[PDB]
Design a protein around this ligand. Sequence first.
Ligand SMILES: CC[N+](C)(C)c1cccc(O)c1
Ligand SMILES: CC[N+](C)(C)c1cccc(O)c1
Lengths: 527, 527
Amino acid sequence: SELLVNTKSGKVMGTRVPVLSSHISAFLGIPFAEPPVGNMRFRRPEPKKPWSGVWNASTYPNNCQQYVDEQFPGFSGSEMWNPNREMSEDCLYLNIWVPSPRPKSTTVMVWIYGGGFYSGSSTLDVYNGKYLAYTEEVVLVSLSYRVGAFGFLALHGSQEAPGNVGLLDQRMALQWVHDNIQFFGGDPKTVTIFGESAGGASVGMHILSPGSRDLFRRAILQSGSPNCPWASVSVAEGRRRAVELGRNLNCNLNSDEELIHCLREKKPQELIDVEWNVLPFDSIFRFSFVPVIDGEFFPTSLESMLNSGNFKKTQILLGVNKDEGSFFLLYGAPGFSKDSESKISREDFMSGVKLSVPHANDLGLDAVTLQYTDWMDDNNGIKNRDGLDDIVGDHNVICPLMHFVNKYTKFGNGTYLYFFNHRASNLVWPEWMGVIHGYEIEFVFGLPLVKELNYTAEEEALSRRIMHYWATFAKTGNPNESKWPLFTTKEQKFIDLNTEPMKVHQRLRVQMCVFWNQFLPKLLNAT
Amino acid sequence: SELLVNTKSGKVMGTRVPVLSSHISAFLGIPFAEPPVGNMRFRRPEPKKPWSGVWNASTYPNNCQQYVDEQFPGFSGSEMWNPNREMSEDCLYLNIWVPSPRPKSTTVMVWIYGGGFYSGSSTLDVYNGKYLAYTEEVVLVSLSYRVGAFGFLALHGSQEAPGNVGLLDQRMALQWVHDNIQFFGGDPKTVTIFGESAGGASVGMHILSPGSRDLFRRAILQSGSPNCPWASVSVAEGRRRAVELGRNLNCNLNSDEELIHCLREKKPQELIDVEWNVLPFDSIFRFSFVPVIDGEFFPTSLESMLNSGNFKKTQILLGVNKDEGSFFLLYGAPGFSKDSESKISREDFMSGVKLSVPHANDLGLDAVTLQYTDWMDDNNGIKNRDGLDDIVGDHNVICPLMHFVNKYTKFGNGTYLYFFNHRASNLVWPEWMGVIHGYEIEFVFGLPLVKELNYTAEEEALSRRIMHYWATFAKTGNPNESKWPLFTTKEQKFIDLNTEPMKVHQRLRVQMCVFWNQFLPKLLNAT
Ligand SMILES: CC[N+](C)(C)c1cccc(O)c1
Ligand SMILES: CC[N+](C)(C)c1cccc(O)c1
């Protein structure tokens, strides 16, 4: 039977799932590690003990314990990102969509969900690999990793809570794909890892971590790069936030051992209830428990690794959305509200930039303000709104990503850069938010093909084109079967991804990224 | 006789001069002080001892000793600015153009020549007051002042060379106009002082100096404001450059007395030969001997005087030319040459900005570069050229002027701001130089009315309009008899001055002046 698969971990029984006018196989909820519960909480993952009998892989698994967005109760714009299955510490599982008839050796695509390292679920509707698997004849794998304190609490030096274990969770699943995907028709030598936002940063981190580079071949990074200001913290900072977390739960802070012991006694929600109280600054687009630059997973600073070529050389496909900052302003900047146009006052703007660049001194804030302010119309509410959107997007996603691609492309084997600037027609988020962070995803996963979701015809076409670009790139290292140009350090070409005839541009937001990548950093160091 | 005038200094005999199809009276070369020669060199001017008999005022006087521009031998673009009469330390004289029949009590206009405080002559052809006097029925006065070391050498504390004596020379002539212009048909209570570049700065300085404010009523500032980075130095700097000058002439530097004594023995050209060797930096748009903030002429810092309203409140008419920097780049920046298009390399640009902002640290230079560089086309030679033009103009003329008008307009009685962006049709300077510093002058003085100079018809009209605007403003404090709007701190309106139908704009080069007036200064102070 096509739904019975034998693996090195045990036999697995999938389920047949309807897709468009056909069907495909799905192996949902395969364990790839031992449940990280009890005294395993905060520990590196353990390979899953082989099992006996058939593992029922017909239904989605639990989602990892995470902060649930309740900012807009019942609103689909935000609930669609929330856990849609019971939450549990026992959440290290993977899901596989396999073409029918089962392929012999086809391209494997491994999806790594984003969500600021504090949230994320592999079971979301927008992450349903069946349309992609089915349409592009790829084996689609979606993994899960521990988020929040559970996956990123870091007490560097201790082995009970070393930090980065959520990154190790990904590694482990990658390890399991490497070792068992051939039994599902997939070629373990043509495994493309792809993710968005924290998923995209995760991808880039796997590219940099020596212990991960051999587990996959190609990488796709969506609105995320490993050097994003929010993707990692120092081990000192990781430690400070861990103590602070303990402080918030009235933990003995006399030793790591006492601290960790206290944190393992706490119920999951207790850690989640106080998770946001350990940020060091009042800010937006900053998450509490993220990857730490520990000297293990990451041998040295990401920047020295990027400068010295210390990373896996391969082909990479990456890009950004036009309005990456909008979502974060909405949830944490004053003056923004879902149901208004969010025209922003100069007073609100100034406080907005302060939240956006939390580490800057006043001079830094002044440099940002000068750079993003139209001084010929500094009271324009639309312009202040939009300028703020760009500030948040440019600094947190686009410029860090642009720095990454420029460092990467010096040593890599092929860089393909996109700019997704298409606003879905059926978007429920206010128009001012633009082409929102995370909204390329439904296009990558082919949601626009299911008519009942009401996308336009042109949007179906764009999805098909993006899916084909992504699958083709995973298969051969080149998106192309007009042409999506190679990104080179000299020409810096990139393409637009929208319902209009693709256009080729150069130097994505140069002016601003020179400001964020070269000038601001120099400013803050000088002062 | 209409050419014989009796004054409190003695009788003066003018000459009848043809003007267009008529004539007017001219009193050329009236002494307004004792010749500042011999041991008077560097000293404050002395009122001219009354004379007996008729003073022959039929021919232009000598020009003050000054650096002669020999950079383009025989080229009129630059020779027209050079002394056109014997040069002499005996150069404190004034010239008066009076309508015929001699008026009874008309508006007086006193022209103060610019030239970086190192050069300048009242006798230039472009400064011929006959067309203005004649056309607008104003009494036109042109004065002279000591330039270079002779008028601005400053050994603060010494009385032999106190500094600012070239400013006192202007004051003295203003004093003489005050006291004797009624005998020429002029109203000493409706004296408008106007000047360009260093002349414009001089005007603004007279507005600030307590000892000068009562000598005139209204002021016109052309491409110059008292707070320009090159218009004054500290007394310490004034002292350092004086010693350095002495050092260059092998003067005893043991005391001011010895130093000054040595400098008075030197022949004029000896001081001029080494004048540029005392600048402290490699730079453009910086002159050696300029006004010093001494505590006398200028009670406190210009900025505290500007902030506290410590200045004469009246009506002011001021403005800038579109390409104020072009002239200086041509003479001191690498890559610029008269006969080429001066496309500028990124290497030359970078060295250009360094010459332009001599006091900035590398971070400052980076801030300037970031601000004026099109990073989407950073190798464009035209763009680098033009960007440099703007850098020099914005920093030395336009933004200091904009800061002045904004401080002034808080306390003054009427600010009128123009932007002269008309390139004369018969200009001999290369096209890339644009609307060059100093080229509004021929329009203000009505040269375009003399057909043999070959201006266009539209240029005749523009001259007439500018002359009428200037004369009308001097007469009533308002340029208007469409309308040249009042400049207000809230609306910041200004007008264009060109052969096209005047247009009203707002906030002249805001973006850049916030950079020069607020951000850069904050940057350099922080660092
Ligand atoms: C846009 C929503 N999504 C779940 C993808 C999300 C949430 C938090 C941070 C992110 O960067 C992205
Ligand atoms: C443009 C020529 N002109 C004599 C007016 C001149 C010379 C030196 C410095 C100036 O600002 C202006």
